[PDB]
Structure formats: C-alpha cells, structure tokens
Design a protein around this ligand. Structure first.
Ligand SMILES: [Cl-]
Ligand SMILES: [Cl-]
Ligand SMILES: [Cl-]
Ligand SMILES: [Cl-]
Ligand SMILES: [Cl-]
Ligand SMILES: [Cl-]
Ligand SMILES: [Cl-]
Ligand SMILES: [Cl-]
Ligand SMILES: [Cl-]
Ligand SMILES: [Cl-]
Ligand SMILES: [Cl-]
Ligand SMILES: [Cl-]
Ligand SMILES: [Cl-]
Ligand SMILES: [Cl-]
Ligand SMILES: [Cl-]
Ligand SMILES: [Cl-]
Ligand SMILES: [Cl-]
Ligand SMILES: [Cl-]
Ligand SMILES: [Cl-]
Ligand SMILES: [Cl-]
Ligand SMILES: [Cl-]
Ligand SMILES: [Cl-]
Ligand SMILES: [Cl-]
Ligand SMILES: [Cl-]
Ligand SMILES: [Cl-]
Ligand SMILES: [Cl-]
Ligand SMILES: [Cl-]
Ligand SMILES: [Cl-]
Ligand SMILES: [Cl-]
Ligand SMILES: [Cl-]
Ligand SMILES: [Cl-]
Ligand SMILES: [Cl-]
Ligand SMILES: [Cl-]
Ligand SMILES: [Cl-]
Ligand SMILES: [Cl-]
Ligand SMILES: [Cl-]
Ligand SMILES: [Cl-]
Ligand SMILES: [Cl-]
Ligand SMILES: [Cl-]
Ligand SMILES: [Cl-]
Ligand SMILES: [Cl-]
Ligand SMILES: [Cl-]
Ligand SMILES: [Cl-]
Ligand SMILES: [Cl-]
Ligand SMILES: [Cl-]
Ligand SMILES: [Cl-]
Ligand SMILES: [Cl-]
Ligand SMILES: [Cl-]
Ligand SMILES: [Cl-]
Ligand SMILES: [Cl-]
Ligand SMILES: [Cl-]
Ligand SMILES: [Cl-]
Ligand SMILES: [Cl-]
Ligand SMILES: [Cl-]
Ligand SMILES: [Cl-]
Ligand SMILES: [Cl-]
Ligand SMILES: [Cl-]
Ligand SMILES: [Cl-]
Ligand SMILES: [Cl-]
Ligand SMILES: [Cl-]
Ligand SMILES: [Cl-]
Ligand SMILES: [Cl-]
Ligand SMILES: [Cl-]
Ligand SMILES: [Cl-]
Ligand SMILES: [Cl-]
Ligand SMILES: [Cl-]
Ligand SMILES: [Cl-]
Ligand SMILES: [Cl-]
Ligand SMILES: [Cl-]
Ligand SMILES: [Cl-]
Ligand SMILES: [Cl-]
Ligand SMILES: [Cl-]
Ligand SMILES: [Cl-]
Ligand SMILES: [Cl-]
Ligand SMILES: [Cl-]
Ligand SMILES: [Cl-]
Ligand SMILES: [Cl-]
Ligand SMILES: [Cl-]
Ligand SMILES: [Cl-]
Ligand SMILES: [Cl-]
Ligand SMILES: [Cl-]
Ligand SMILES: [Cl-]
Ligand SMILES: [Cl-]
Ligand SMILES: [Cl-]
Ligand SMILES: [Cl-]
Ligand SMILES: [Cl-]
Ligand SMILES: [Cl-]
Ligand SMILES: [Cl-]
Ligand SMILES: [Cl-]
Ligand SMILES: [Cl-]
Ligand SMILES: [Cl-]
Ligand SMILES: [Cl-]
Ligand SMILES: [Cl-]
Ligand SMILES: [Cl-]
Ligand SMILES: [Cl-]
Ligand SMILES: [Cl-]
Ligand SMILES: [Cl-]
Ligand SMILES: [Cl-]
Ligand SMILES: [Cl-]
Ligand SMILES: [Cl-]
Ligand SMILES: [Cl-]
Ligand SMILES: [Cl-]
Ligand SMILES: [Cl-]
Ligand SMILES: [Cl-]
Ligand SMILES: [Cl-]
Ligand SMILES: [Cl-]
Ligand SMILES: [Cl-]
Ligand SMILES: [Cl-]
Ligand SMILES: [Cl-]
Ligand SMILES: [Cl-]
Ligand SMILES: [Cl-]
Ligand SMILES: [Cl-]
Ligand SMILES: [Cl-]
Ligand SMILES: [Cl-]
Lengths: 78, 78, 76, 78, 76, 76, 78, 76, 78, 78, 78, 76, 76, 78, 76, 76, 78, 78, 78, 76, 78, 76, 76, 76
C-alpha cells in the first residue's frame, strides 16, 4: 500500500536508529543493504545523488559534514 | 538466461494478475516489492519515469487514468 | 500535534460520517463542512488531494471504477 | 475572455462527447480539426507531446491503452 | 459541490458586497472576513490569486490601471 | 505499383476473407498465409503494425474494446 | 506573399487596436482567436513563450506589468 | 490589510501566547487553535513554513539546537 | 480519420500544385494559410524548423536552393 | 537577518523611488551601484537575465516597454 | 562497511568466476540477479549504461566483442 | 498464432536441421531456404538478429568463441 | 551466404532483367515479382531503400533527374 | 595577491566565527554582506548554489541540517 | 521618414530604372550608384539582402530560375 | 579618428541642429540628411540604434514617455 | 593565408565542377577525398551535419532533393 | 562512389590486418595515419569517441580490454 | 548613466594600468577588488569564465599565455 | 560588380594611398574619406573589420606587433 | 606509436617555428595544412574550438591577443 | 606487490605506531615520517585522503566527532 | 631537468633491470624500490599509469596478452 | 603539521637555496633533490604546479617574462 518513498524512509530510519554515532555517508548504502537486501533507490525517487535524496528527508536524517567534507548521517529524533 | 526486461515483465505480470481491480500506480512499486523483494528498475531499462516504462509494455499492462489524473494498472489479458 | 496528524484525524472523522464512502470530488466540501477549512494537501507536500490521500493508506481506502470515478472510505 | 487552455479543454470535451466508443489518439488531431478548424496546440500549452497534454486534463479526457500500446481517449463523465 | 464551485460562489458573494469593486491586494482579507479562510488559489491549480481570478471570467471582472493597480468587480 | 499500394491491396484481400474481422495479434499470420510474407510495417515507415494500419483508414476499420483488444475489418 | 511573422504582427495590431484599455496577457490568445480563428504561433516564430514573442515586436505592442506581475498589452501608437 | 500583514499579526499573537517559545512542529496546530486555520506559507510564496518564518525576522526569532530541533519566539 | 501528418501533406501538395514556378520558402506559410486558414504545424509534427519538416516529405515537396541560400519548394510529381 | 532577495528588493525600491520618470533598464545596474556600491545579483537570485529578476518582483518594480523594445523601470506605488 | 561500488565489484567477480566461457552481456543482469537477488546498480554508480560501468572495472571484468557487436564478459584473472 | 510464435517455431525447425549448429552469419540464408523469407528481427522489436535470438533462450543456444565467432544451436 | 550477399545477387538479377533501368518507386514490386519478398533494407541497416542502394555501388548505378526522379541500372 | 576563492574563504571564516550558535543558511548572505559589503560570489567560484559552494570548503564551514531541512553553518574549528 | 520607408523608396527608384529587372548579385552596386550607399539589410533586421527583399513584397517581385539565379523587379 | 569617434561627433552635430530634440524613429533620416549615410550601430557592436545611443550618454540624452515614445537630445 | 572555410569552399567547387549531373550527397565525401586526399571538415567549420555546411555555401553548391529524400549537389554557376 | 563510412571501414581493416597481435587503441589513430595520411573521422561518422565508432563496426574490429582498462583492437576474421 | 559593461571596462583599465608587468589572471579578481571593492561580474555580463569576458574586451586588455598555460593580462595601449 | 568586389577595389585604393600602411583603428575613417561610407564588414558576413580583412589576403597584408597593434598594407 | 595528440603537437610546433612573427589564428589551419596536408583535429582531441585546443598546449604555442581581439600564435621556446 | 597493497601495509604500520589513533589532518605527515613520502590517494583513484581510507575498512577505523573532527585507528 | 625527463630516465633504469620485462601491476613497486617513490602519472597529466607509459614509446614497449595481462619492456 | 604546511616549508627551503630564483620547469627537480620527492600539487587540490604556487603568495613570488617563461623566488 505504501508509496516507494514512504517505504524507503522507514527503512532508512531503521538503519540509522541502530547506530548511535551515525553512519558515514560512504558506508550508508552498504549498511542499508545489510538490513534490507537492496540499495537506496535515489535515482528512482527523482534525485541526482544520494546526498540530494537525504537532504529531501530532514525529519528522517540529520546531515553533519566533517572537516574532510564527508557527511555523517544521524537518525533525526522521532 | 533471460533479459532483464523480460524478467521484469514476467514479475510485473505476476503482480498485476493477483489484483482483479488493478493496482493504482502510486501503490505499484510497493506491491511489486511485496512479491519480488525489489523495485521495478525503470531507469535501468531506459525510461525517465515508471509510467513511461509501463507504456512500453502494453501486452503486459493496461493503463487507465482516473478523473484525478492517477493511473490504475491492470493485467492485460494474456 | 503535527499538522499532518491533525489533518489525518479530521479526515478520518469526515469519512466515518459516511457509511457509503465519499466521492472524491465532494470530499473537500464535506471536509470543510465539518472542520471549517480545506484539506491542506499542498502544505502537506502533495500536488493533488488524491496524492495526499495515497500518503495515508491506514486512514483512507480508495476505490477507482472502470470509468475512472473515485470513492474514498474510512479505513478500519 | 477565456484562457487558451480553457478554450482548448472545452473544444476537446465537445469532440470526445460525440464519440461513444472514444477516439483513438492517432485520429484525435484530425477529429478535433473537423469540429474546430485547427489543431490542438499542445506545444503552446507547455507539453512535449499530445499525450502529455491529455494526461494534464484528466477531468476532460480518460486515457486507456490497448494491447498494441495505442491510446483511446474517452470523454470523462461531466 | 466541488471545491472550485464553492470558492466561486463565495468569491461572488464577497465581490457583490462592494459596489465600487475591491482592490486586489485587499481581496484575501475581505474574503476571509466573510468566509473564515483564504482563497485557496494554489489548491485550485494557480500560481497567483490573480491567475485564479482569470480562470473565472464569468464571476469577476478585472480592471488594471495605467499605474498597474488592480480592481476586481462582481460580474453580472 | 508502389510497395505501399501492393501491401494495401493484399491487406484488403486478407481482411475481406473474414466477415467477422481479424484480431490484430492474428493479422500477421493470416496475412502471411495468403501472401507468403509479413506486413512490412517498418519498411513502410511505422514503428508498429497498428501505426501502419492507422495510415490506411480507407482500407481497414479498427475497433478497440474497453479491455484493450483490437479487431480489424475490411473497409467498404 | 507576406512572411508569417508579418501577417501575425498585422493581426495582433488589429486585435489590440479594438481595446482602448489594452488586453491582459492571459486573455490575449482568446481575443486574437476571436478575430482571426487561430492562436498566435509564438513557438513557430522562434520564441519560448508568448511574452518573449511580444517583447520582439515593440512597435506593435506595448507591455506594462501590474502589481500582481500580470502583463497588459496595448497597441503601440502607429 | 494584505494577506501577509494579517498572517504576520496573527503569528505574533500566537507566539506572544508562549513565553517559552513554540517548537516549530507544533506551530501550525497552536496557530490554528487561535485563528481557525493554517499558516498559508505556500500562498505567501514559500516552499516550507520555516522558509516563510525566515521572511519575517522582525516577528519571529528562530533558534536551532545542535540536534536540529527548532524553537520559535516572539520578537520584541 | 487521417493522421495529422497525412492531412498536412495533402494540404501542402494542394498549395504547391497551384504554383508552376514553385513557392519561395519564406512565402510558404502565408500561401498555405491562404488556402487552408492556418499555419503548417511543423513543431507539432516533431521538427525544429519548417525546412526540416519539408525535408521529411520528399514525395510531396522538392527543395531547390538558390544562390542566396533561399529554398524554393515545388510540388514533387505525383 | 534579511534574506538576500529581501535586501536587494529594498535597495532596488530605494533606487527607483529617486527617479520620477523611472530608470531605463540599460542604466539600472549603474544607478543601483551608485546608491549601493555593487550590482544587482540577478544570477544568484536564480534568474537568467536582469529582466527576468525584475519581472519576479512586480510589487517593487513596474516594467513598461518603449517602441524600440527597451524597458523603463518605475517604482511600483507602495 | 564497504562502499557500494566495492560490494558490487565483489558480487560481479563472484558471478563471472562461475562461468568458464564468460557471460554474454545481454544475460549478465539475469545471471547476477540469480546469485545476488538484485540488479547491478550501474546508474547509481554514476554510469549511463551497464557497458560503461563494466569498462570502469577492468581488473574485475574483461570485455570482448563478437562479430555481431555483442559483448562477452569474462572474469579478469585475480 | 502470433508473429513471434510462428517465427520461433520456424527458427527451431531450421536449427534442428543442423546437428553441428549454424554459424550466425549463415542463419538468415538457411532460414530463408526453409521458410521463403528472412527472420523479421526488426518487426519483432530488435536492433539485430543476435538481439532477437537472445530474446528466445528456450529456443536457441548461443556459443561465442574467443575470436568472436557465433554459433547457434537448437535448444532441447 | 550472408544475407547482404544474397540480397545483392538477387537485386542484380532484377536489374539485369531491365535494359532501360527500373524507376526506383517500382523497384520493390519488380524485385518481389522475382524473389517472392521485399528488399530488406532496414534489416541490412539502412533507413531507406535508396540508402541501401548507395551501399552497393558495384551493383547498381543510380541516376537522378533534375525533377528528382530516380532510375536504377545494373552495374556491369 | 590572493585567489578570489581564498579571499572569500577568509571572509566567510570571519563571518562565522562571530556567531557561537552558527548562522542559518537563509541568513548567511546578509550576515556576510554586513561584514564585507558584498555577496558570496558562489556562481563565479563555479557552484550552482550557495550550499554547493559551502560543501566545497569543509575546513572553513561545518554544515548541519535541521528537522525542517534548513542548514545551519558553523565555523569549523581552525 | 523611417529608415525602412526611405530605403524602400530608394529601392523602388533603382528597380524602376530597369525594365528587364536586376540580377540580385548586382543589386547592391546599382543601388549604391543611385543612392551613394549600400542597402542596410542588417540594420533593418535581416540576415541577408534577399531576406530583406522578402519583407517588402509590395515593392519588389522576386523570380528564381531553376538554376537558382535570382532576378528582382519593380512591383507596380 | 576611430569610427566610433567620428560617428559620435556627427551624431552630436545632428542633435544640436534640433532645439526640441529628435524623435528616435526620425533620427536615422535626419542623420543621413547631414552625413550622407546611416548611423552604423551594428558595426559599432549594438543590436539596435537605441542600444548604441545608450553607449554614448555624454552625447545624447534620451527621454521616454509613458506611451513609450522616445526623444533624443544633444547633451551639453 | 586563406581561411579554412575559404579553402574548403574552393576545393568543393573544384569537385562539383567535374560532374555535369552533380554529385549525390551520399557520394560527396568520397568524391571530395578523391580530389583532395581528405574529408570535408564540416564539424570544424561549425556545422552539425554535412548538409548544414552545404546550405551555408549557396554560391558554391546548389542543393536539389529527389523523391527519395536524397540530396544532389551541383556546382552553382560562378 | 563509396560512402565515407565504407571507405573508413576498409582502411581500418587494412591497418588492423598488418598487426598480428592487434593495435592498442591509444596507438590506433597514429597507425591508421601511417597507412592513410589522415585520422579516423569518428565525429563526422556520428560518434562521440573513437571507441564508440569502433563498437559500431564489429565485423571489422574486435575489441578486447586489458586489466588496465585499455582496449586492443584486432582485425575481425573476414 | 553608464552601462554595467562600460563601467567594468573602465575599472579594469584602471586596475591594469597600475601594473607595468601586467597582472597574472589568477590574481586579477583580487587586484580588481583592491581598487573597486567588488569582483568582476563576468557571469552577469554574459560570459562563462573570466577569461571569456576578458577576450571580449581586447581594446582594454591584452592576453598573453605563459609556458604553464597561465594568462597574464596587460593594459592595451589606449 | 558584386558588393564584395567593389568593396575590395575601394579598399585597395585606400591602402595604396599609404606607403607606410594604415593603422587598423584608422582604416574606417581613411576609407570613408575616399569612398563616402564605411567598410560594410557585417553585410559581407564578418563579425569584425579585421575578420573581413582576413578574407581578402590578396588585397591586404596584416602585420601585428608584439604589443598587439595592427597595421594594414596594400598587397602587390 | 605516438598518440594523436603528440603527433599534432609536433606538427604544430613545426608549423610555428617557421614563422618568426608568429601565425595569426585565422591563418593557422591553412598554414598547418600547407605543411602537413590536413587540418588540426581539435574536435577529435576533445576541444570545442581551435583556440581551446591551443590553450591546452602552452609549452608548444604562446597565445597573444591584439587590439581587434584576434589571436597570434608563436612557437613557445623549446 | 601492487601499489595499493604496499600503501595499505605501510598505512597499517603507521596507525599501529599510535595507540590513541591519529588525527586525520596529521596522518600524511606521520606517514611520510615513516615511509619517506605521501599517501598516493589520487593515484589509487580517490578525490581525497579520507575517500581512500574508506576503501580500506579492514585496515583503518574512522571515528568522526560531533564537531566534525576525524580520528583514524588501526583495525585489528 | 624537467620532471618528465627525470621520471623517464628512472623508468628506463627500472625496466633495464629486468631482461624478461616487468608485469604492469608490479611496476610501481619495482620502481619505488629503485627510486624511493611512485611514478607520478597524475602529475605528468595522465589518468592511469598505462596512459603515461603510452606517452613514452621510445622508452617502454608494452605487450598485452589475449587474457589482458600487460608486460612492459625497456625499449632499445 | 598539515601536508600543505610541510610542503610550504620545504618549498621555501628550496627557493631560498637560489638567490637568482628557479625557473619553473626546473622547480620539481630541485625540490626533489632536497626533499626526496615531488611537490604534491594534485593532492593539495591543484591542476598544475603553477596553480599550487599561486595559492601560496606569502611563500613564492612568481615573475613571468614577455616570452612566457616563469621564474620563482623566495618571498621574504
Ligand atoms: Cl514515492
Ligand atoms: Cl560510520
Ligand atoms: Cl535508483
Ligand atoms: Cl550519489
Ligand atoms: Cl551522494
Ligand atoms: Cl522528512
Ligand atoms: Cl560523503
Ligand atoms: Cl533488457
Ligand atoms: Cl490499488
Ligand atoms: Cl532503475
Ligand atoms: Cl516515476
Ligand atoms: Cl511514473
Ligand atoms: Cl509488451
Ligand atoms: Cl499516478
Ligand atoms: Cl494547501
Ligand atoms: Cl485530486
Ligand atoms: Cl472522481
Ligand atoms: Cl492557458
Ligand atoms: Cl476512433
Ligand atoms: Cl502547439
Ligand atoms: Cl505528440
Ligand atoms: Cl502524443
Ligand atoms: Cl482537467
Ligand atoms: Cl497512440
Ligand atoms: Cl491554496
Ligand atoms: Cl496576485
Ligand atoms: Cl493591485
Ligand atoms: Cl518491415
Ligand atoms: Cl501492433
Ligand atoms: Cl489486440
Ligand atoms: Cl516569418
Ligand atoms: Cl483585458
Ligand atoms: Cl506555435
Ligand atoms: Cl507562453
Ligand atoms: Cl507568456
Ligand atoms: Cl501575464
Ligand atoms: Cl498555503
Ligand atoms: Cl518547516
Ligand atoms: Cl523542529
Ligand atoms: Cl501524424
Ligand atoms: Cl514564390
Ligand atoms: Cl507547430
Ligand atoms: Cl522554421
Ligand atoms: Cl525553415
Ligand atoms: Cl529560405
Ligand atoms: Cl533570498
Ligand atoms: Cl533613465
Ligand atoms: Cl549574480
Ligand atoms: Cl541581463
Ligand atoms: Cl535583462
Ligand atoms: Cl532594455
Ligand atoms: Cl561507491
Ligand atoms: Cl553466456
Ligand atoms: Cl541503478
Ligand atoms: Cl545499459
Ligand atoms: Cl550496456
Ligand atoms: Cl551486448
Ligand atoms: Cl524485420
Ligand atoms: Cl546479428
Ligand atoms: Cl559470427
Ligand atoms: Cl527490412
Ligand atoms: Cl527510397
Ligand atoms: Cl523516384
Ligand atoms: Cl579562485
Ligand atoms: Cl542564525
Ligand atoms: Cl556569483
Ligand atoms: Cl543558492
Ligand atoms: Cl543554497
Ligand atoms: Cl537552508
Ligand atoms: Cl546594414
Ligand atoms: Cl542575398
Ligand atoms: Cl542570384
Ligand atoms: Cl551598421
Ligand atoms: Cl532602435
Ligand atoms: Cl520612439
Ligand atoms: Cl574559416
Ligand atoms: Cl552522383
Ligand atoms: Cl570536421
Ligand atoms: Cl552529416
Ligand atoms: Cl548530411
Ligand atoms: Cl557561398
Ligand atoms: Cl542525402
Ligand atoms: Cl557514411
Ligand atoms: Cl600495439
Ligand atoms: Cl571527425
Ligand atoms: Cl575518443
Ligand atoms: Cl575512444
Ligand atoms: Cl584505450
Ligand atoms: Cl552592459
Ligand atoms: Cl602579477
Ligand atoms: Cl557575475
Ligand atoms: Cl572563471
Ligand atoms: Cl577564467
Ligand atoms: Cl574592447
Ligand atoms: Cl590563468
Ligand atoms: Cl556592415
Ligand atoms: Cl576590428
Ligand atoms: Cl590596432
Ligand atoms: Cl591523443
Ligand atoms: Cl600571420
Ligand atoms: Cl576534428
Ligand atoms: Cl574554432
Ligand atoms: Cl578558435
Ligand atoms: Cl604543452
Ligand atoms: Cl582569432
Ligand atoms: Cl597521489
Ligand atoms: Cl581528506
Ligand atoms: Cl579532521
Ligand atoms: Cl601523481
Ligand atoms: Cl594502469
Ligand atoms: Cl596487467
Ligand atoms: Cl600530487
Ligand atoms: Cl605548471
Ligand atoms: Cl616557464
């Protein structure tokens, strides 16, 4: 019944909530596949990059950059 | 042995045939994932949207629009 | 207490008013009759009312006929 | 006084309502010209194809695809 | 009973209240005064209030002055 | 004596063989049965057989059902 | 004998000259069709929008914007 | 008497109701409680409620915590 | 019943056959409008320019260039 | 505190209000720089041309075209 | 922990190593899905075609074309 | 009775004629020898004969050598 | 034994039948008369029959008149 | 002597270091103009958006998103 | 008194000088002979002289031969 | 001695001839009357005469009326 | 000393003048190479197709289309 | 008489047949120029890269990739 | 009164004339800002790069490249 | 008698007037002094005067100094 | 053996070294063809213009602009 | 014996030198201290040092703090 | 004394060390063994080591096997 | 202790070795002579050595001659 976008959001929240210190963006597709069996379908959902998809779901994921320019993704409270 | 496109066609036919009143397009990726474990790879298959892929397989899927502009997908007889 | 939570609860109240469901073109009017205002589907992030209703499948069941007419039902 | 889009919508409704079994999309420009004297200005109205314009007016036209992949257009009730 | 039909009727009621027409920037406020809410021009599919008003020429006459100020009148 | 003229005449002959029309998926086979070869719709400049048939409305009448099945008839 | 662009210019001048307080741009295609039987072929004439075509014929049409951002078109004297 | 002026005044009234500020996700509900309707941020030309609030810095002070939670305060 | 492209082809043939010395391309839209009441819908038919549409119908129209680079259009025999 | 767009709007209003007969568009960047010390950042604000930015702020600036096709910009009352 | 690209590389190597005479490119998505349960995410990984992705991993896959123009993919030694 | 079904059956008949398989460049000729015409791979929706043959793996086994030469076999 | 080799030989046979050449629009029909089928110019990789004929200059000489009519001749 | 990019980096660091709780991205151009007299020239520096420029200077600016999807910019230590 | 009006009048004067018309490549020279300068077809908004001449059909008749040579005549 | 310097001086001479200014559509003709030729605004790098005149503000003052008519004056 | 475009023009004129009945466009690159030793550099000269380059040199080459849609190129007198 | 594409094909076959162990793609333009006096005109022939042109002529050239990702080109038998 | 382009030209001439051995292009934006307080608005003026703008004003700036490929900009005499 | 032929001859006449060549910025003025008008480089199909001069190497020799100044000479 | 780019570089150096006062860019293709028999293949080498290719080989060619905006090319010492 | 294998081994040696990990900005210097050169992250195919380190998770553990500072540890 | 000259000389020295050539994957390690550092193929302007080696054909002969393995030899 | 800080210090040491400056093409070699390796301009984020040197104006003064040759000097 759920929209593809709603299902992916729910799975991503499930991935991020396991990890108290967040997930480095380069590791995120792998950590999501570990839970779900497949990749985050960011192109399908209408985004050019995984980062652009993540920006579009701010109530699921908090983005923070590091000095190197890498993103770490945290589960947004709620 | 089968082409990616042939496999997806077969899976989509299997999804749609379960549903006597068809599947609303917004629900289709979810209903296909429920059967198959993954999403319909419409970008891979060379289409910009899921609707454009579905138009390309008329002997698998019948498209009908509603007054709202939403598509419902039916298994095409055969 | 989120906007979406309040709208969802009010929608459920409207749909439950109607045992036979509500034709989608009449939904905005029936909902305003109860709530005093429209369903804020653009604010909630959707291009159409029907697109919003697809986002709440636990609340509303949607039936579409073969002539393309849409009926909305309270989901139990 | 009317917007171009409103006038075209009204003319298209007038075309489709004559035809109880709908109008095949390949025949639609001709059948509309027969009534109106000119073509449906889908590029002007901001669409890349006639099909994309028709999708944008679901309360005027119902689209149904056939096994061949051709569209038939029906007047949407009302 | 469509949203657009109800909005159209309420707009007509507001404009008829005013023999001298209503300056377009004041229309939303006058309309809320009567109806309790705003004119839902985005929901109805328009980028601006004025774009919505152009969609209902049987309801509202629009005059624009040479300094670019807009006045709206009930259409008979 | 053009390719399109010959194909058109042969198609008419096939369709006239069938008072009840010919289901579009069966047309290529019936036509080969009579002519020894397929309808050359790509050579004639069309992406599909049905697209070719639309180019010859004086020859073939096309009916499409509400389930999307297509039947072709000789045009008088 | 005349260029398409010259004919359209002449027809547009004829439309605008009827209207002493000008024609709102949203109403212009309809008012031109009322006189001429067809639409202003702005895409053919090489413009992306009707407004861009109108800008290209300043000795035919004067553009003035209103507070809302709508254009009114006036016949340019001569 | 502009829509934006009225919304701004009503927002100020809501925020002043709350000495401790209002968490941004709760703002729409609190505002409807007072006014009878939602904050019309799309009509006013903004993609989000927060984007609208940034347009009125003389009215609302916005604080964001290091966990990304947002609190809105009446501006003196 | 006819395809838009077939109707336009037929009208164009009718225009060109009147003119024993052909029609200069700059004059063609005007001469076609004189017969038909509207313009040749080359963008609708999927071409960027009128010349590109004309190239696509060689059994209707013969193109010949002049020293200036202008095209003259002749009815192709048949 | 203010958005870039709000600041530019305010500065532009300040420029235009000095000039009772408006400012010719070709002169506007210079007249704005005279007051403010820099140029109107129309590309930053998401517009391809200065004219497109000005169209987007109709409650600040009234556009009127002249017979030559040049724009004059007036402060919109208020 | 692994990058998406590293995981896909490893899975592709596992697919190709089973097949002593290589895998025809048209059959590769199907043969990879048979092992892994999903498709090779070449668009995600930043490539327009499956062939372009495969070219980018030469130490995993050897490409050889046939007279028809079809590619066969072999596991690159190591 | 579909075109693709008939072509598939005729292809199988040709391949079965040859215990040692058929070199792909010779397939069109051998097939015409039996059927009177070519394999209609463009009509069936494929850019090449080999692309068509990939669409029918239950009918034809394809072997490609390390020098890039292709041999086609009847599939049991 | 390639498709293109067989088509080339059959084309030569058709053209040699005609001392005065063959008008290009009549070529498909004359060729079918001899061979039982059409010249497979799309299969062979060409958008048009004339484009195919340009690929075989050792087989066919093409003359075009100043009115744009095309005549094809066997090449010695 | 300095590169444009180095100068802008230095000015941005100066802006952000004043603000202990960071600067909301919507407020950043204004706060930078308050110090420097002009805007951050992100298009000149080769970026489509201000956010894309900021991502490119991670040793100057730390980005953190909020639940709404707004960015707050902090001076990166050093 | 517009540039285009003056150029048009001068062109007419040049063409009337010549009962047998003027070959288009010679027109600029003949026109300069009478007027002291060239026909300003770029200023008037045209990419070519011939494109300008098409804009004034009441002034100049243009004939093009089958070898592509152009002759210009005064229009009565 | 540059082209632009000479054109600028000649323009100034034309404008000074006219105490009441010169309507922009009449400028080319008046200028030719004095100089024997047109103002070479394309050569000088401008799409229009008015665009050229904007490049020389020390030479020409431009007034535009509210009906969009343009008058050019010698600058002191 | 000559511009590339002038040299190519001169060579093309030399090719076409040999051939009293013109040169079919499909044969032109070969016939030009026979005289000159290389191909006509139409992309270098700023054209997308050979036909577009030829259209740009009307005083060198006369284009005439045939019923099939093929161009024949003739030396333009002079 | 021959098409440009046919001539280039023939020359390329002549180049490759000299070299029993094939020609590394980086060396191919030079080795072809050594025989023919000019370069392979892959852009003219409608391809974005030399590799894309070579893929389009599989009955002339066999492509094989190496571990580094370099192509070697072999004359395809016949 | 002056056009933006004329003002920038004048400022650039003023910058370059100070420097007898010219200004290295990488240093130019900084040296111009030192005089003027802002950057050269090359995107506004319709150029993709600063170098493309500079090429467009040859009577202001002389460009000379060095062995490294860096440009030095000199004031053009006058 | 073509425009380009006449311009070429007049240019040669101007350049021959000057044994020491003519600095390119002064060429338009010197040429007008002799001919009464400017060199019509845009009409002749060139973006600049210098681009036109490159099209006539048999007429004008162009020297450019290391400071980028250009001198034009009659070609013998 | 040499890369296409290396061969062209060597030929260009050979052209430029003959000419003590350099070669005007408009004359360069002709002067290179005079030595080599063909044109500089700048599109093949991946550049949109001849000037862009020349910029890419600064140790072969020195570019200097003139007041008109024309480039002169000099052999770079070495 | 691959470059990547050698770099990986040398990196492990550097990280093992440090029980408390190594701050990422100091890693290049510490690594050069041991090896005589820098970590060749561009050669190995990565835009940044950190991007390279992500490619070797069996060798280096990366911790990032909430202020965005990065610490690298030998992986057991 | 250029970087490329020094790298070229050092590469030659490494390759000459090996009568049987050096497998390309081992080249970086062998070269570092002699020189103390890697071959700087990115600095020298190449995307890969093999792309750099193609730029110096007078120094290194490259052989590629039919399984795609690469061997590098000193060029005499 | 950053890579860029160490490279900067080593560069300064090399340049100070040379009172007369160092020609840019010789810089990499002189720097390797002192440090054992190349200047890592790609790692540091620059397309060229000269682009890197522009990033450190407090360290190196760059002079370019009118023939385009570059000399680098220690900055005091
Ligand atoms: Cl979705
Ligand atoms: Cl992590
Ligand atoms: Cl995806
Ligand atoms: Cl991504
Ligand atoms: Cl990403
Ligand atoms: Cl969200
Ligand atoms: Cl990242
Ligand atoms: Cl597929
Ligand atoms: Cl459903
Ligand atoms: Cl996909
Ligand atoms: Cl989609
Ligand atoms: Cl879709
Ligand atoms: Cl299908
Ligand atoms: Cl839908
Ligand atoms: Cl809403
Ligand atoms: Cl809806
Ligand atoms: Cl409905
Ligand atoms: Cl509309
Ligand atoms: Cl129908
Ligand atoms: Cl249209
Ligand atoms: Cl369409
Ligand atoms: Cl369509
Ligand atoms: Cl609708
Ligand atoms: Cl259709
Ligand atoms: Cl709304
Ligand atoms: Cl409005
Ligand atoms: Cl108003
Ligand atoms: Cl076919
Ligand atoms: Cl079909
Ligand atoms: Cl059917
Ligand atoms: Cl036109
Ligand atoms: Cl109106
Ligand atoms: Cl149009
Ligand atoms: Cl529009
Ligand atoms: Cl518009
Ligand atoms: Cl409007
Ligand atoms: Cl809203
Ligand atoms: Cl929000
Ligand atoms: Cl929040
Ligand atoms: Cl059509
Ligand atoms: Cl005509
Ligand atoms: Cl059209
Ligand atoms: Cl056109
Ligand atoms: Cl056209
Ligand atoms: Cl034309
Ligand atoms: Cl803003
Ligand atoms: Cl002004
Ligand atoms: Cl900007
Ligand atoms: Cl602009
Ligand atoms: Cl603008
Ligand atoms: Cl303007
Ligand atoms: Cl990855
Ligand atoms: Cl296989
Ligand atoms: Cl993908
Ligand atoms: Cl693909
Ligand atoms: Cl692929
Ligand atoms: Cl393949
Ligand atoms: Cl076929
Ligand atoms: Cl094949
Ligand atoms: Cl084969
Ligand atoms: Cl075919
Ligand atoms: Cl044909
Ligand atoms: Cl013919
Ligand atoms: Cl920079
Ligand atoms: Cl803030
Ligand atoms: Cl910018
Ligand atoms: Cl932005
Ligand atoms: Cl941004
Ligand atoms: Cl933001
Ligand atoms: Cl002109
Ligand atoms: Cl002309
Ligand atoms: Cl002529
Ligand atoms: Cl001019
Ligand atoms: Cl003007
Ligand atoms: Cl005027
Ligand atoms: Cl050229
Ligand atoms: Cl020929
Ligand atoms: Cl080319
Ligand atoms: Cl082409
Ligand atoms: Cl072409
Ligand atoms: Cl020409
Ligand atoms: Cl052709
Ligand atoms: Cl070809
Ligand atoms: Cl080789
Ligand atoms: Cl090419
Ligand atoms: Cl390439
Ligand atoms: Cl390539
Ligand atoms: Cl390669
Ligand atoms: Cl400007
Ligand atoms: Cl400097
Ligand atoms: Cl800018
Ligand atoms: Cl730049
Ligand atoms: Cl630049
Ligand atoms: Cl300049
Ligand atoms: Cl530079
Ligand atoms: Cl000119
Ligand atoms: Cl010049
Ligand atoms: Cl000069
Ligand atoms: Cl190369
Ligand atoms: Cl020279
Ligand atoms: Cl090229
Ligand atoms: Cl170029
Ligand atoms: Cl160039
Ligand atoms: Cl170089
Ligand atoms: Cl140049
Ligand atoms: Cl590296
Ligand atoms: Cl890093
Ligand atoms: Cl760090
Ligand atoms: Cl390197
Ligand atoms: Cl490598
Ligand atoms: Cl290897
Ligand atoms: Cl480096
Ligand atoms: Cl360098
Ligand atoms: Cl140097």
């Amino acid at each position: 019944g759920m929209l593809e976008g709603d299902l992916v959001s729910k799975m991503l929240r499930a991935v991020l909530q396991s990890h108290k210190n967040g997930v480095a963006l380069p590791r995120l597709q792998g950590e999501y596949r570990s839970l779900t069996g497949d990749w985050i379908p960011f192109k399908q959902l209408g985004f050019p990059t995984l980062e652009a998809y993540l920006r579009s779901v701010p109530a699921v994921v908090r983005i923070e950059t590091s000095r190197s320019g890498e993103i770490t993704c945290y589960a947004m409270a709620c």
